[PDB]
């Protein structure tokens, strides 16, 4: 899958990872490749992307 | 299969099983804690893994500063209940008397006094509805461990007699693997609910 953190200013990361997971305003959530078309707002919290063993954290604000 | 008591006051066979489980727990503890090694290997890493497992459970229930004291009660409690559940499965011998050396936890008095000892400790370190809830959780913890070991003990025994009297290896094999599973799950829920009431009364 391709994950792309997009700001109104410009694109931030825009690469491919293994399994991205972030916490929504309802609660925790994880995304495996091949997920259902899903829509959830985010809270002010980081987004972990799990590039192998790296787990590069991206802190979103506002967020969707 | 009657209650064989040499003395009128107390069951003799239960005391024998308590002594043999205390000695086997003490010797596996001193075999895992022989010498000091900064790089863990062998069985010292296993004892440290159980130690940090109990610690993790304490950290789930309470603050680490409050519950740090309970770690050495909790690790001997989980290992004691662990070996006490797994002793009833290999031998469970029958002698010409009433009964000898089944397991300690199958005795109801052993498990109920161990549960009321747990709750006496968490009252020591620590309005009618609260006290009936207290007696309720004591007796449901004791009856939990007693029933979930004693039913498996009777079933294993029944299977043993059905095999010996007249082909039936794999049903008791599946049940006996499920019974060591029940033993480790009952030990873990017993020590975890112990630490839950300890955290509920300390903080």
């Amino acid at each position: 899958i391709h994950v792309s953190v997009v700001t109104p200013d410009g694109p931030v990361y825009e690469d491919d990872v293994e399994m991205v997971s972030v916490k929504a305003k309802s609660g925790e959530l994880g995304i495996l490749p091949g997920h259902i078309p899903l829509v959830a707002p985010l809270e002010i919290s980081a987004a972990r992307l799990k590039k192998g063993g790296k787990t590069q954290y991206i802190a979103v604000s506002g967020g969707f | 299969p009657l209650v064989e008591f040499l003395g009128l006051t107390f069951n003799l066979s239960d005391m024998l099983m308590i002594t043999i489980t205390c000695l086997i727990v003490f010797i596996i503890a001193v075999a895992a804690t022989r010498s000091l090694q900064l790089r863990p290997t062998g069985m010292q890493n296993f004892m440290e893994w159980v130690f940090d497992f109990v610690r993790g459970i304490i950290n789930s229930t309470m603050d680490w500063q409050t519950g740090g004291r309970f770690l050495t009660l909790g690790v001997t409690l989980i290992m004691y209940v662990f070996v006490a559940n797994m002793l009833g499965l290999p031998f469970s011998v029958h002698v010409n008397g009433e009964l000898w050396w089944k397991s300690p936890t199958a005795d109801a008095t052993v498990t109920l006094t161990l549960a009321v000892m747990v709750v006496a400790l968490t009252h020591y370190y620590g309005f009618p509805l609260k006290i009936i809830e207290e007696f309720a959780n004591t007796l449901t913890l004791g009856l939990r461990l007693f029933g979930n070991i004693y039913a498996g003990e009777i079933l294993l025994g029944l299977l043993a007699s059905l095999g010996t009297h007249y082909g039936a290896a794999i049903p008791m094999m599946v049940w006996q693997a499920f019974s060591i599973f029940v033993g480790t799950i009952q030990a873990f829920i017993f020590t975890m609910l112990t630490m839950v009431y300890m955290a509920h009364k300390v903080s």
Binding site: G27 | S60, T61, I132, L139, V196, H200
Partner: protein, 71 residues
């Protein structure tokens, strides 16, 4: 003669009610700690007081089951 069956339906219906109640409570606290895993103690203490309620009425039922047995 019928007091045995009386104690038996008492413990059976108490077990059924406690099983369904405990199953509902622990089910929804699984999904509670799955949505927001940093709320584990505040879910856990309320879980255990709910377990205390849904067992404590079948517990006094099964305490009464023995005096049903004797008669």
């Amino acid at each position: 003669s019928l007091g045995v069956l009386a104690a038996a339906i008492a413990v059976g219906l108490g077990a059924l009610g406690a099983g369904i109640g405990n199953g509902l409570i622990v089910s929804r606290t699984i999904e509670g700690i799955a949505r927001q895993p940093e709320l584990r103690p505040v879910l856990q203490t309320t879980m255990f007081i709910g377990v205390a309620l849904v067992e404590a009425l079948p517990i006094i039922g099964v305490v009464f089951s023995f005096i049903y047995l004797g008669r």
